[PDB]
Every structure is written in structure tokens, then in C-alpha cells.
Design an enzyme around this catalytic site. Structure first.
Site, PDB file in Angstrom:
ATOM      1  CE  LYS A  86       5.740   0.980   0.653  1.00  0.00           C
ATOM      2  NZ  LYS A  86       6.503   0.040  -0.361  1.00  0.00           N
ATOM      3  CB  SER A  94       5.267   5.939  -0.291  1.00  0.00           C
ATOM      4  OG  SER A  94       3.881   7.107  -0.075  1.00  0.00           O
ATOM      5  CE1 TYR A 129       2.255   1.913   1.564  1.00  0.00           C
ATOM      6  CE2 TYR A 129       2.035   4.204   1.603  1.00  0.00           C
ATOM      7  CZ  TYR A 129       2.432   3.249   0.798  1.00  0.00           C
ATOM      8  OH  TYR A 129       2.984   3.208  -0.434  1.00  0.00           O
TER       9      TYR A 129
HETATM   10  N1  LIG Z   1       0.120   2.653  -6.466  1.00  0.00           N
HETATM   11  C1  LIG Z   1       0.502   3.871  -5.875  1.00  0.00           C
HETATM   12  O1  LIG Z   1      -0.026   4.980  -6.039  1.00  0.00           O
HETATM   13  C2  LIG Z   1       1.922   3.709  -4.802  1.00  0.00           C
HETATM   14  C3  LIG Z   1       2.183   5.104  -4.455  1.00  0.00           C
HETATM   15  C4  LIG Z   1       3.322   5.088  -3.804  1.00  0.00           C
HETATM   16  C5  LIG Z   1       3.997   3.786  -3.800  1.00  0.00           C
HETATM   17  N2  LIG Z   1       3.753   2.782  -4.271  1.00  0.00           N
HETATM   18  C6  LIG Z   1       4.684   1.433  -4.237  1.00  0.00           C
HETATM   19  O2  LIG Z   1       4.394   0.669  -5.361  1.00  0.00           O
HETATM   20  C7  LIG Z   1       4.410  -0.790  -5.170  1.00  0.00           C
HETATM   21  C8  LIG Z   1       3.461  -1.477  -5.768  1.00  0.00           C
HETATM   22  O3  LIG Z   1       2.381  -0.494  -5.930  1.00  0.00           O
HETATM   23  P1  LIG Z   1       1.054  -1.321  -6.796  1.00  0.00           P
HETATM   24  O4  LIG Z   1       0.491  -0.034  -6.500  1.00  0.00           O
HETATM   25  O5  LIG Z   1       1.685  -1.669  -8.084  1.00  0.00           O
HETATM   26  O6  LIG Z   1       0.203  -2.176  -5.816  1.00  0.00           O
HETATM   27  P2  LIG Z   1       0.176  -3.784  -6.670  1.00  0.00           P
HETATM   28  O7  LIG Z   1      -0.635  -4.392  -5.260  1.00  0.00           O
HETATM   29  O8  LIG Z   1      -0.472  -3.748  -7.876  1.00  0.00           O
HETATM   30  O9  LIG Z   1       1.490  -4.533  -6.706  1.00  0.00           O
HETATM   31  C9  LIG Z   1       1.915  -5.211  -5.575  1.00  0.00           C
HETATM   32  C10 LIG Z   1       2.445  -6.481  -5.972  1.00  0.00           C
HETATM   33  O10 LIG Z   1       3.255  -7.145  -4.815  1.00  0.00           O
HETATM   34  C11 LIG Z   1       2.738  -8.443  -4.563  1.00  0.00           C
HETATM   35  N3  LIG Z   1       3.171  -8.741  -3.149  1.00  0.00           N
HETATM   36  C12 LIG Z   1       2.770  -8.385  -2.072  1.00  0.00           C
HETATM   37  N4  LIG Z   1       3.236  -8.737  -0.947  1.00  0.00           N
HETATM   38  C13 LIG Z   1       4.171  -9.719  -1.416  1.00  0.00           C
HETATM   39  C14 LIG Z   1       4.957 -10.527  -0.814  1.00  0.00           C
HETATM   40  N5  LIG Z   1       5.074 -10.750   0.606  1.00  0.00           N
HETATM   41  N6  LIG Z   1       5.493 -11.552  -1.521  1.00  0.00           N
HETATM   42  C15 LIG Z   1       5.662 -11.392  -2.712  1.00  0.00           C
HETATM   43  N7  LIG Z   1       4.891 -10.578  -3.576  1.00  0.00           N
HETATM   44  C16 LIG Z   1       3.861  -9.679  -2.720  1.00  0.00           C
HETATM   45  C17 LIG Z   1       1.322  -8.389  -5.099  1.00  0.00           C
HETATM   46  O11 LIG Z   1       0.755  -9.755  -5.279  1.00  0.00           O
HETATM   47  C18 LIG Z   1       1.472  -7.374  -6.109  1.00  0.00           C
HETATM   48  O12 LIG Z   1       1.532  -8.103  -7.336  1.00  0.00           O
HETATM   49  C19 LIG Z   1       4.439  -0.828  -3.448  1.00  0.00           C
HETATM   50  O13 LIG Z   1       5.676  -0.970  -3.166  1.00  0.00           O
HETATM   51  C20 LIG Z   1       3.808   0.592  -3.297  1.00  0.00           C
HETATM   52  O14 LIG Z   1       4.113   0.922  -1.848  1.00  0.00           O
HETATM   53  C21 LIG Z   1       2.412   2.656  -5.115  1.00  0.00           C
END
Ligand SMILES: NC(=O)c1ccc[n+]([C@@H]2O[C@H](COP(=O)([O-])OP(=O)(O)OC[C@H]3O[C@@H](n4cnc5c(N)ncnc54)[C@H](O)[C@@H]3O)[C@@H](O)[C@H]2O)c1
Ligand SMILES: [Zn+2]
Length: 325
Positions: free
Chosen positions: A145, A117, A141
Site C-alpha cells: 500500500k 491503509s 500488505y
Molecule cells: N476492508 C477494510 O477494513 C479495509 C481497510 C483498509 C483499506 N482497505 C482497502 O479497501 C479496498 C477494498 O476493500 P474491501 O474490504 O471492499 O475488499 P473486497 O475484497 O470486498 O473488494 C475488493 C474488490 O476488488 C476486486 N479486485 C481484486 N483484485 C482485482 C484485480 N486485480 N482486478 C480487478 N478487480 C479486482 C475484488 O473482486 C473485490 O470486488 C482495498 O483497496 C483495501 O485495501 C480496506
């Protein structure tokens, strides 16, 4: 062979990345605990329900599938939740990532693509934000990261793990063909909230500040289309496959977007206005945040091709009760 383990692959960005992987001839294998993701989004290959903290199960999975790369999306991702509940973020994001990296090194599973992030930077010195910018995150958060990024570096030193860390601000939009979207509950992201409000699924959209030092007075942030994110994560896989060196790069358009622009765009493309409730700006809140995408262009040959505001809005809108006209 061609298995790619997509950890967190039942979620928003992970499921889009699995779809893309399969389009390029890989066999995505999703490992996900379904805490915030959705089993119905695992449509392009095998599904293993499991927690990344369940190290035996994760190792078992890597041994069965011998993945050529691991893409790590599995995290807790909510800023305000992290200030009030840091335990959750240190456990899932630091403990969980360490468990994943141990599973990798103990199975000689080599290539890790880490979804990071731009929150790791905190408040920057210059805009746009280059990778050289100091990383001083101001919430747990961002903190967790950053810790994962340094853990990656340490595991590379000690165990020869190879990796690409990908930093970006706000994932947005949805698959162009309309069958895969962002399903969070609670939904905390800005463009989904604005759309839900326009659709009547939320009563109001509270917006904090119209007197920023920005062209329209509302704050400017950085949005990248989720399909573009999918593209970059797979390019990162290719990079490590082709014996590339470890990387940490920004993903984005290099251009920011204001709240007003978003609200205006929604009203225009969907014919429904966002019921904005303008509140006082919070002191010490940045007028503009967006990333410098030049390094990713150089090292990955990556450019966004779907991250124009209109595409972001048009592809997301049908998932939040709106119609594109
Ligand atoms: N969405 C954004 O704007 C954004 C921005 C920067 C970084 N990110 C990174 O993108 C990744 C996911 O983003 P998303 O927005 O798709 O969120 P999201 O919650 O839709 O996907 C997260 C997935 O991880 C699974 N998960 C969480 N903890 C887990 C664990 N301990 N074991 C197994 N599975 C687990 C959840 O069930 C989910 O399917 C993360 O690393 C998040 O930090 C997202
Ligand atoms: Zn969301």
C-alpha cells in the site's frame, strides 16, 4: 460527463461507494474481476468484468466511459495472507496499481482516488496517528500500500496525475437500509467474525490478550463505518474536480474501540453473546491503534456521521445471522 470508474466496485467498500455515487447523480461504472467481490452487488450502473492487470481491457474501458474520476479499491487486503504469500500482494497491489495508473495516464483519465491503509504507518510514536507519522509498515500488505502511495506521487511528478490517497484502519458496518453487506470468504475481519460467532456461524472467537495496557485490558483498534468511507471517497472526487491539490489523509472517528466493547455491544443489541476464547496476548502487539482525522476535516470537510459503535453494530448484525432488538 458524470461516469465514475469504480475499480473493485463489486466488493464491500466499492459497492457502497457506487451506491453513494449514484445517489449524488454520478453514474458509477464498476470494473472488477469478481475474485472476492460479487456481481450481484453491482446494482447502480454498468458492469465491466475484468482484471486491472488486463491493461488493454482497462484502457478500452476508460476510452469508452471517459470517467471524470477513478476510485481504486481493487486490491488484496489480508494481512496474514500477505506474510505467507507476499507474491500475491506485490503482484495485485503494486503490479495491478501500476497497470491502472498507466491506463489512466495513457487515456488522459486524470483523477485517481486511492483506497490506502493506515497499515502503512506500522508502529506509531504518538496517538492518535497523524499523517506526519513515519511510514514503516511491518508486513507486505502495508508495504505494498505504501509503494502504491509513492507510485502515485511519482506519476504525479512525471505525468501530472492528480490524486487523493485515503488511509483508514477497519471498514465496518453496512448500508443503513440493509440490502448491502460485507461478504467475504474466508471472513477475516473482527466485527464480522464476532457476529458470526454470536450467531453460531462460527464456533468461537479467539481473542488474543486481556492484559493490554487499556481500560478493559483488551486491545483497542480503529473502526469506521463503510458508508462514511463511501462519503469520503466521493468527497475526494469532488475535491479533485474543484481543482484541489493532491492529498493523503486519514479517515476515522479519532477514537478507538476495544474488543470487549464490541463483544458487549453485540450481546446488548442482538441478545446473543459472543463465545469468546481468551488466549495469551502476543508479545509486541500494540494496545491501541487509531488515526487522527483532523486533516481530512480541514482538507475535505469530512466528518464521520455513521461511525458510532451502535450504528456500526446495528447495521452489520442482520448480515451475519443476528437480529437487532
Ligand atoms: N476492508 C477494510 O477494513 C479495509 C481497510 C483498509 C483499506 N482497505 C482497502 O479497501 C479496498 C477494498 O476493500 P474491501 O474490504 O471492499 O475488499 P473486497 O475484497 O470486498 O473488494 C475488493 C474488490 O476488488 C476486486 N479486485 C481484486 N483484485 C482485482 C484485480 N486485480 N482486478 C480487478 N478487480 C479486482 C475484488 O473482486 C473485490 O470486488 C482495498 O483497496 C483495501 O485495501 C480496506
Ligand atoms: Zn471482511
Amino acid at each position: 460527463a458524470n461516469n465514475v470508474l469504480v475499480v473493485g466496485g463489486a466488493g464491500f467498500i466499492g459497492s457502497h461507494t457506487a451506491k453513494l455515487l449514484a445517489g449524488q447523480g454520478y453514474a458509477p461504472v464498476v470494473y472488477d474481476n469478481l475474485s472476492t467481490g460479487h456481481q450481484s452487488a453491482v446494482r447502480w450502473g454498468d458492469f465491466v468484468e475484468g482484471d486491472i492487470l488486463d491493461q488493454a481491457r482497462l484502457v478500452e474501458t476508460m476510452e469508452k466511459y471517459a470517467p471524470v474520476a477513478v476510485i481504486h479499491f481493487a486490491a488484496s487486503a489480508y494481512v496474514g495472507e500477505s506474510v505467507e504469500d507476499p507474491a500475491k500482494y506485490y503482484r495485485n497491489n503494486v503490479g495491478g496499481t501500476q497497470s491502472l495508473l498507466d491506463a489512466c495516464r495513457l487515456t488522459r483519465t486524470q483523477n485517481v482516488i486511492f483506497s490506502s491503509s493506515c497499515a502503512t504507518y506500522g508502529v506509531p510514536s504518538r496517538l492518535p496517528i497523524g499523517e506526519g507519522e513515519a511510514q514503516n509498515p511491518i508486513n507486505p500488505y502495508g508495504r505494498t500500500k505504501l509503494i502504491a502511495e509513492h507510485m502515485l506521487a511519482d506519476y504525479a511528478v512525471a505525468y501530472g496525475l492528480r490524486y487523493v490517497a485515503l488511509r483508514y484502519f477497519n471498514a465496518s458496518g453496512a448500508d443503513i437500509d440493509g440490502e448491502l453487506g460485507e461478504k467475504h470468504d474466508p471472513e477475516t475481519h473482527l466485527i464480522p467474525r464476532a457476529m458470526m460467532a454470536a450467531a453460531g456461524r462460527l464456533d468461537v472467537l479467539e481473542v488474543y490478550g486481556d492484559d493490554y495496557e487499556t481500560p478493559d485490558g483488551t486491545c483497542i483498534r480503529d473502526y469506521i463505518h463503510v458508508t462514511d468511507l463511501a462519503r469520503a471517497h466521493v468527497l475526494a472526487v469532488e475535491h479533485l474536480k474543484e481543482a484541489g491539490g493532491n492529498l493523503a489523509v486519514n479517515l476515522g472517528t479519532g477514537r478507538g474501540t476495544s474488543i470487549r466493547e464490541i463483544v458487549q455491544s453485540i450481546g446488548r443489541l442482538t441478545g446473543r453473546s459472543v463465545p469468546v476464547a481468551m488466549r495469551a496476548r502476543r508479545a509486541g502487539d500494540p494496545p491501541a491503534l487509531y488515526a487522527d482525522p483532523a486533516l481530512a476535516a480541514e482538507k475535505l470537510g469530512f466528518h464521520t456521521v455513521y461511525s458510532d459503535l451502535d450504528t456500526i453494530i446495528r447495521t452489520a448484525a442482520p448480515h451475519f445471522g443476528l437480529e437487532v432488538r
